[PDB]
Nucleic acid binder design. Structure first.
Length: 84
RNA sequence: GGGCGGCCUUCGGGCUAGACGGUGGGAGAGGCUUCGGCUGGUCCACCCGUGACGCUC
């Protein structure tokens, strides 16, 4: 994933070398929340791994909450640069 | 929605010591498995990134 993860970081960074901004963080949660749902499909018995998903979904909503009520400009772009 | 909540400010702002992320690691009993594998937590380093984004009902 130092390939895939890093791809999205290059994609959602705010500057050459950014890896922690609210954007990159959301981009990663996003990417992570998708690769797990796709998983849960195959292994729908896994109720345990489901938990994790519940969290990342919340963790992401909270970061977004922060951004929305912090810099909408940056917000609106990030949400229409993915979905919601 | 409720309660609580970092540092400095001449209140306009400024921070990184929390939190999250990135990078590199630790764990003899996490879950599902079409057993050929997917997937959730968890602890530690840095002192790279954001910058209080936290905590609690």
């Amino acid at each position: 994933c130092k390939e895939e993860k890093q791809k999205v970081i290059q994609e959602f960074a705010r500057f050459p070398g950014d890896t922690g901004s609210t954007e990159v963080q959301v981009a990663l949660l996003t990417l992570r929340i998708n690769r797990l749902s796709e998983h849960l499909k195959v292994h729908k018995k896994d109720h345990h791994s489901h938990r994790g998903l519940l969290m990342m979904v919340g963790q992401r909503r909270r970061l977004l909450r922060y951004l929305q009520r912090e810099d909408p400009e940056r917000y609106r772009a990030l949400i229409e640069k993915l979905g919601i």
